[PDB]
Amino acid sequence: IEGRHMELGTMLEAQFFTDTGQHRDKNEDAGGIFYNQTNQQLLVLCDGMGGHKAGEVASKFVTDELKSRFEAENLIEQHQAENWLRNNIKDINFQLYHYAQENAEYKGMGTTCVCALVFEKSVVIANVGDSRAYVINSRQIEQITSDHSFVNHLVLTGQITPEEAFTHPQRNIITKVMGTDKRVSPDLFIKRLNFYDYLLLNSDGLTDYVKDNEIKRLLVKEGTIEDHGDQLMQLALDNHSKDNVTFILAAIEG
């Protein structure tokens, strides 16, 4: 294959925030911020399904697998990041499928998974489920991923409006999730970091109770990344969120 130049290793100031919530008992969200041998940065977030058994086992499994595989890696080019994320996500899905099938305590477990590979100017995002990746600056908050949910299937087919989907009685249903099938087709995205201040990854425990406007205005205000994370978690709890709330906040600079 053709001669290509090595981009430098790049990372963003990113922090991981997770909370079980008062209303639930255990945290079935997992995730983390991991680095490979050349110090490339991978952000990982998983939402284990609460309606099924052992959501924390599934999310923890996918997270630990991605951490091990990525930390074992040396270099991933930008034009190969899509293949890397898709392949490893597929294999982890297969392993999680047989993991749930063979263990009777874990029968039917599953988890969402959104993850981002950070490069000098782009971010490569892979998504399976209704966890989200946003990009935010002073003027716009754009959701990069598309929810693999039923209500978003109705939205994308003109059957309901997004505002209707936010209060739809079946807004919890997931249509693509890890561990339920032998195969999975993850959604893959490339996003330019030119004109944005924040990359956000979050489970639905946040955005099921905090709309994009509130996130945008909270983030575009002044304050450090720790202050923004604290205020964002507290805003999720103030809007009476009753799921696990987890998000990675990544500050971007030119």
Residues annotated in a binding site for Mn(2+): 28-29, 47-48, 130, 198, 204, 208, 219, 221, 228, 243
Q: Which residues belong to the annotated binding site?
A: 28-29, 47-48, 130, 197-198, 204, 208, 219, 221, 228, 243
Question: Per-residue DSSP letters for 126-147?
Answer: EEESS-EEEEE-SS-EEE-S--
CA distance 127 to 131: 7
Residue from 205, 215, 241, 248 touching Mn ion (CB under 5 A): that is 205
| For Mn ion, the closer CB: 9 or 21 | 21
Site for Mn ion in 14-33 (CB under 5 A): 28
User: Crossing angle of helices 212-220/225-238, nearest 10°?
Assistant: 150
Nearest to 134 by CA among 7, 36, 252: 252
The DSSP bridge partners found for residue 90 are none
Q: Specify the residue for token string 């034009």.
A: 79
Residue of closest CB approach to Mn ion: 204
Between CA 28 and CA 2 the distance in angstroms is: 44
Residue type, 9: G
Residues in 127-146 that interact with Mn ion by CB under 5 A = 130
The nearest distance, CB 131 to Mn ion, in angstroms, is 8
User: Could you say which of 243, 247, 249, 252 contacts Mn ion (CB under 5 A)?
Assistant: 243
Rg (CA), the chain: 18
| Window contacting Mn ion (CB under 5 A); options: 14-22, 47-55, 161-169, 234-242 | 47-55
At its nearest, how many Å lie between Mn ion and the CB of residue 232? 16
CB of 217 to Mn ion, least distance (A): 23
> By C-beta, is 54 or 123 nearer to Mn ion?
54
Distance (Å, rounded) from C-alpha 80 to C-alpha 131?
23
13-19 β-sheet, strand order:
13-19, 245-251, 198-202, 132-136, 141-143
Instruction: Identify which of residues 48 and 186 has a Cβ nearer to Mn ion in the complex.
Output: 48
C-beta of 172 vs 231, nearer to Mn ion: 172
User: Is the CB of 79 or the CB of 107 nearer to Mn ion?
Assistant: 107
Show the CA angle centred on residue 62, arms to residues 178 and 86, nearest 5°. Answer: 65
The binding site for Mn ion (CB under 5 A) comprises 28, 47-48, 50, 55, 130, 203-205, 243
